[PDB]
Amino acid sequence: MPSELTPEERSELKNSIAEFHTYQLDPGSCSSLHAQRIHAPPELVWSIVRRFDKPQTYKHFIKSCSVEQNFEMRVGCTRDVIVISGLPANTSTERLDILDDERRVTGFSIIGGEHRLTNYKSVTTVHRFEKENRIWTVVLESYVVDMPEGNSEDDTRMFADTVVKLNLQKLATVAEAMARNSG
Amino acid sequence: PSELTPEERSELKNSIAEFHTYQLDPGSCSSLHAQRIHAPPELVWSIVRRFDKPQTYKHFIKSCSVEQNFEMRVGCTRDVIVISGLPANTSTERLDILDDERRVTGFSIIGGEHRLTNYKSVTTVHRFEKENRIWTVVLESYVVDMPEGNSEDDTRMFADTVVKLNLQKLATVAEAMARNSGD
Ligand SMILES: CC1=CC(=O)CC(C)(C)[C@@]1(O)/C=C/C(C)=C\C(=O)O
């Protein structure tokens, strides 16, 4: 029942963390890794996580997300996310960096607008677990960001940690709701 | 919430009328949220009535201080410090209502570095019983002044996000306290 990963989960994710969630830090950057257990099939979770054009399905504070007219989801495509965690609303342009449907890995970079200066980059991976009868999922999300050059010069990285956590909670809630409509 | 059942709805009609209904003033906007909680209403009330400890059930609070003499009576104030990353650093709030017999509390934001002018919130706590089970519904509503008519949706969107999140945290915290009190 503790939300923290078990030793078995942790062992099973080591290779994934090494491959996908380990960053080469530039001086004056930092990185963080979050995990969320989800009681729903990993295919269902991944179908949510992979939709680069619809982050608002599991993320908080999103006013809108717009993509190109005829949107084809591929590495290098961009989206504009308007967030209302700032008043007035801020626009960030994000690039899709990784999409592997076989291995269930996606990731993005903030390349313009608000927080461009941060060099924010994030990776999310979805993992299958099975024991006894039961199948469940663990999502890992990590990011790397520049540290602010100040004593409180918009040092917003605690807010980044906090919002990654809440977003993973929203993903769990949404995905678990959907799986109970399956049968 | 996840959503009020038809039964809950009808039982709450009077409370909704008395505490959670607003006159359709232009340049103001209002919203009502509900949250089901699987814990005793006395326990939920004991958390929500603590004007000097909003951080027990609210997200985004770094700290809160009250006067050096604090008696919690209507008209008292608290100085809430917010984590960085949000439209505000601080908020000064005044207790409007505290009714221990009816389980109703409310507050108004009166100062601070932020964007929520004339924000006023009311929270009411409700007992439900069906068969051999007790649960709580919490209702929270607010009214606030909009910057403009087009930027009204953003203010409502922001405040709705925080209120929904804080009610979710209230549910998780009350549910966790109820377990640990038993065993
Ligand atoms: C989290 C936060 C960010 C802001 O920018 C405004 C303010 C500082 C007031 C606030 O505490 C907002 C609190 C809200 C909406 C509701 C509450 O507290 O019941």
UniProtKB/Swiss-Prot annotation, chain B:
CC terms in the record's Gene Ontology section: cytoplasm; cytosol; nucleus; plant-type vacuole membrane; plasma membrane; protein phosphatase inhibitor complex
Compartment annotation: Cytoplasm; Cytoplasm, Cytosol; Nucleus; Cell membrane
Superkingdom assignment: Eukaryota
Motif Gate loop location, chain numbering: 84-88
Keyword Cell membrane: yes
Region of interest: START-like: 22-175
Xref: Pfam families: Polyketide_cyc2
Main subcellular localisation: cytoplasm
Free-text description of this protein's post-translational modifications in UniProt: Ubiquitynated and degraded by the proteasome upon binding to the E3 ubiquitin-protein ligase RSL1 at the plasma membrane.
Motif (Latch loop): 114-116
Miscellaneous comment in the UniProt entry for this protein: The synthetic growth inhibitor pyrabactin inhibits ABA-binding and subsequent PP2Cs inhibitor properties.
Function: Receptor for abscisic acid (ABA) required for ABA-mediated responses such as stomatal closure and germination inhibition. Inhibits the activity of group-A protein phosphatases type 2C (PP2Cs) when activated by ABA. Can be activated by both (-)-ABA and (+)-ABA. Promotes drought tolerance.
Matches recorded under PANTHER family: ABSCISIC ACID RECEPTOR PYR1 (PTHR31213:SF6), OS08G0374000 PROTEIN-RELATED (PTHR31213)
Notes on the domains: Upon interaction with ABA, the 'latch' and 'gate' loops change in conformation leading to a tight dimerization and the creation a surface that enables the receptor to dock into and inhibit the PP2C active site.
This protein's name: Abscisic acid receptor PYR1
Organism: Arabidopsis thaliana (Mouse-ear cress)
Underlying gene: PYR1
